[PDB]
Design a protein around this ligand. Sequence first.
Ligand SMILES: O=C(O)c1cccnc1
Length: 313
Amino acid sequence: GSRARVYAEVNSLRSREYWDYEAHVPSWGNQDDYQLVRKLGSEVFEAINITNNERVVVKILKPVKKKKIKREVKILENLRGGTNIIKLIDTVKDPVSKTPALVFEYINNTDFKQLYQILTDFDIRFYMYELLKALDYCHSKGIMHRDVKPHNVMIDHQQKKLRLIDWGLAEFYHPAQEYNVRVASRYFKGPELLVDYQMYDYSLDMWSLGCMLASMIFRREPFFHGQDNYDQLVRIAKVLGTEELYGYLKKYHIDLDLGQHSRKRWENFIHSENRHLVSPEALDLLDKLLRYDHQQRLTAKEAMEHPYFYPVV
Ligand SMILES: O=C(O)c1cccnc1
């Protein structure tokens, strides 16, 4: 088996009300207090609260879903006021359609496709640090995000603001609990998910964070571009090495079902167009995040102490 190295028992130490999301009963206000003005790139809208003129974000939930609405609302409520976590303002329902929606603080996202082309080395350090603050917070609150990717990391580069959003895939970590491995987006799935290892933990988010770092400093996005679930692991093995994949599988007693490849040096991904983004310290932090062995990956708190972030601290 396996368990998390840092916040393993925090949900156990809390009231059952904290993590028993199925017993959670949201109070649904009236969505007609909100004017949905601009569809953002679930259907998500920039909106105005018509009573106080406040600019907000309204995310329309899938009505049919019951359990995942309860889970997302409870997690957002537990995480409210956490650093760089999107702030849930209200839970409302449309009068006509009775469809549930969530109201959030507004953030003006730049869109990573254009943003990642103009980021400096410092910016990447800066925003990775901001994102790690979010992850250490939510992990410390016993929650795995399980969908960390550029699309769920809002960045307002004008105001230098970051919000980790979209907690509809998030779950409470309980030691030895077996989780669905088909969470997250293909490109940001840790190998533990891809080899069907169900007793994963917060470190899954640390893999995803590493993919983001690699794509940003190397300007290859997504960094691990699998064509389907299977190929996703081959893409990873093409970098971390096929023989090292087996060593990981032999550990944790995991039965795999590719080719030969051998582990690449992170330095081999450097060329003229990303050399000014890559440093030895970025590559060392990267090597400690993008590791087969989920127990060896830095925790968010450990990653924040890495020399990579000294200039940001
Ligand atoms: O999905 C969310 O939680 C979300 C989406 C856009 C903006 N704020 C939050």
